[PDB]
Amino acid sequence: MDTVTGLPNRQLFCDRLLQALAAHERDGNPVVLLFLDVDNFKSINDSLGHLVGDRLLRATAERIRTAVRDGDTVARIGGDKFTILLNGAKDTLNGALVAQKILDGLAQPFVFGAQQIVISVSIGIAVSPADGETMEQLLRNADTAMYHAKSRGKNNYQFFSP
């Protein structure tokens, strides 16, 4: 597992995603991938030090889990990004309602001692199969949507556009 966050390894996430894509390919309960970026993490980690930085990453990972559904998988990547697998997103409007719940949870302050921390977040979303069939295509597409979102603002989300 990821020592910093306690989240599943990249390998386990990978295994989880492959299985979900095999199990859910119906338009009514598709696999949806969210790629989350803690936009201002570097400045925080630099200013406050890695001790606080790691604590923040772990608190962010847990809040993300509280906002997804039991059965979904969350894993860290690239230091300050998180790949979120929605294992059958029926009734979530292709993950949009999950992305909104995450943003609501992450908009709350992270208090470390007397230091209030507010992170800025950007989420890219990719829906199978329209946004990719393979896990690599889905992830890369959610990643692209993420950076697009980040370029246009903060505390936002957007779906990949073919």
Side-chain angles (χ1 to χ4, degrees), residues 6-47:
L7 293 178
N9 297 316
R10 176 50 45 191
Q11 178 65 60
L12 181 53
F13 176 94
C14 168
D15 290 358
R16 294 285 186 64
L17 177 45
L18 292 177
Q19 200 62 61
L21 286 169
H24 310 301
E25 287 306 321
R26 278 171 34 193
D27 190 65
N29 191 28
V31 167
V32 179
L33 214 55
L34 274 55
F35 218 124
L36 184 156
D37 188 344
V38 179
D39 300 337
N40 65 339
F41 184 77
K42 172 184 165 55
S43 57
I44 302 299
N45 197 59
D46 292 321
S47 295

Side-chain angles (χ1 to χ4, degrees), residues 5-154:
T5 64
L7 293 178
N9 297 316
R10 176 50 45 191
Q11 178 65 60
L12 181 53
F13 176 94
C14 168
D15 290 358
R16 294 285 186 64
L17 177 45
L18 292 177
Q19 200 62 61
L21 286 169
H24 310 301
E25 287 306 321
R26 278 171 34 193
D27 190 65
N29 191 28
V31 167
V32 179
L33 214 55
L34 274 55
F35 218 124
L36 184 156
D37 188 344
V38 179
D39 300 337
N40 65 339
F41 184 77
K42 172 184 165 55
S43 57
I44 302 299
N45 197 59
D46 292 321
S47 295
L48 311 186
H50 302 192
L51 287 174
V52 172
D54 294 340
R55 293 186 62 188
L56 176 53
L57 289 176
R58 194 182 189 75
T60 298
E62 301 171 329
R63 290 192 187 177
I64 292 177
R65 297 193 295 192
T66 71
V68 296
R69 298 83 47 70
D70 186 60
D72 293 340
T73 303
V74 181
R76 188 166 66 100
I77 192 175
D80 61 358
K81 267 74 68 179
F82 294 93
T83 50
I84 299 154
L85 162 58
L86 302 188
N87 191 20
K90 181 172 190 173
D91 304 308
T92 64
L93 295 176
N94 304 115
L97 296 185
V98 174
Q100 284 166 18
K101 188 170 187 176
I102 294 169
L103 291 171
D104 290 345
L106 302 185
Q108 297 169 302
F110 287 94
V111 188
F112 297 115
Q115 191 48 278
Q116 299 279 295
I117 299 300
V118 53
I119 56 173
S120 55
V121 176
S122 282
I123 303 176
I125 294 169
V127 187
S128 183
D131 294 337
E133 277 295 3
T134 63
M135 67 169 266
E136 176 183 347
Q137 298 180 309
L138 205 61
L139 281 161
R140 287 175 57 181
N141 286 167
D143 200 37
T144 297
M146 187 190 82
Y147 282 118
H148 277 164
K150 186 183 178 192
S151 74
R152 106 159 144 215
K154 67 178 181 294

